[PDB]
Every structure is written in structure tokens, then in C-alpha cells.
Amino acid sequence: DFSHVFKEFAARGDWQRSLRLFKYMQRQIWCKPNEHIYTLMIGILGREGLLDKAFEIFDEMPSHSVARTVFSYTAIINAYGRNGQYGTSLQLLEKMKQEKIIPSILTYNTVINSCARGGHEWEGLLSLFAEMRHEGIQPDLVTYNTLLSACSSRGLGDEAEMVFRTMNEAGILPDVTTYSYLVDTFGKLGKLEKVSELLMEMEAGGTSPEVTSYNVLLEAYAHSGSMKEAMDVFRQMQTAGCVANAETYSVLLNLYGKNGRYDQVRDLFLEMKMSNTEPDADTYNILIQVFGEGGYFKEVVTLFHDMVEEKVEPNMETYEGLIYACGKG
């Protein structure tokens, strides 16, 4: 019941009441706090940024005859990493190793994440992974997603290629998360064909590729000047079949504005429109801008009749262009 109350207080952020209850139970013989209550209090203190109080509570454990477990070490490592203290996490890992405490897969993953977020060299992450492998750590799906990122965090071109291939070459791939992060890394270096691959890898895996996923790659794909590739990616996203908010179309259309087929614009509109994905305040503004640059001002007026009927409300930029249209008209 004490642990349940502590968890409920940590869910609401009542660190003060939890600390008071812990300090009161510490003086009670019938309610002596155990290692679980100490870990819960340390986590509650770390969630609020009370590193000093958490450290004091962790140090008072031996005076209270409370057992210490890798759990507390992993919690301290995660608390240090959340503030960018990668060196402190490495020192805590070394101290735990000196204390004959066998590190777990979660502790190694937390240390790798802390090193990645703190700006440590990719060589350090590779050495940490090699050490974890030499001490027989166990792979996990969540760890694998964060591991695909490890190379991405480094940002090296070779690392970016390895980040993506880590899943493909060994033959084990997370359906969505690994593909997204690897695609992100592939992009800065330049996913030359890695872009087609990233969607293909996620899609035929046995899980249909995510729409948001299709879009994130797609948006950069536009930055890439990928147009036929992105169009193909759009027909490909169309192949994906994942339900998509008109926002995914919106982004691509905006690039297509420079393309200005102007009937390409027309066609896409009908389909997203009748697909229960009414154009967004954003999409309407984009459409007005795209049409306006290439004329069709009468059409611009028409969009006003249309927006009103839809009942989606206008916005500052929205009203604005509509007036420019009138003016040029």
C-alpha cells in the first residue's frame, strides 16, 4: 500500500508529501521502508530535479540497512544522463563495475543514450557497445531502436550508413522506429537511394509503413529536390495505404507549387477532399498561395465560398491572401 501511494503521488508530482511520508516511515518500526520504496522515492526526486535529495536518500540506505541494487545505479545513471552529464554516468557505471554489480541491458542502453545526448565521440559509443557485447548483454527491441539511433547521433556518413544497415544487414529490423531514425541519419549525409529503401524496408516488412513516417521522409525528400522521387514516394505513400491526414498531401503540394502543374494541384485536391480529410487552415492557405502565384483569381474567390461551406474557420494569413487575390484581380 505504501508503494502504491508513492506511485500515485509520483503520478501527480507530490514529491513533498512523498518525502514527508518516507521520512515519517523511516522512524516507524512497523512501516520501515524497503528497497522498492527507496527506489520509488529516488525516482520521484529525480523527476522533479531534486538530485541532492535523491543522493541523500540513496546514501542514507546503508545507515537504514537497505539493500542496494542495479536498479538504483541505473536510476542514478538515467538521472545524470537526462541533464547531459555523460561523464557522471560513465563514472557511476565504472563505480558499479568496481562494486561487483553486474550491469544490465537497460543500464547499458541508458549509458549509451546519455553518451549520445551529451555529445560523446562515436568511438566511445562503439567501445561501450563492444564492452557490453563482451560482457554478454542481451538485445532488446527498444534497445535496438535506440541503437539504430546511436550511429545517427554521431552523424558520421559511415555511421549513418551503418545505422540504417544495422537493421537490414543482420536481418532483424523494428517495423517503424528503427526505420525512421535511420532514415533521419541517412538524410543528412544523403540517402541516395536510401530514401526509397527506407519506405520499402518498413512497408513490406509485414507492417504497413506509417503515414507520419512516410511524411517525415517525404518532407526532407522535398528539401532534397526529390520531386519525381517524392512523387513516386507520394504514389508510394499512396501504395502504403496507411490512413493519412491531408497534412501529408499539403506538404508535398507546397513543393509542387513551384512545379506548378496547376492541374496536378487540381487533381490531388479532389481526392483528399472527398477522403474525409478536409483541407486544413494550413492547406487552404497553401492552396490559395499556390493558385495565386499562377493566377486564377476568380478561383481564389471561389475558395472563399467553399471554405465557408466547409465551416473550417479562416486565419490571419488566410484572410490575407484572399484579399491580395482580390486586389490583383
Side-chain angles (χ1 to χ4, degrees), residues 10-11 13 33 43 46 49 54 62 67 75 79 81 84 87 103 116 118-119 124 130 136 139 150 155 157 160 170-171 174 187 190 204-206 209 220 222 225 230 240-241 244 246 257 260 279 281 284 291-292 294-298 314 319 321 323-325 327 329:
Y284 272 132
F291 281 121
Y296 327 118
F297 299 112
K298 189 66 67 176
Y319 271 132
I323 229 67
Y324 170 57

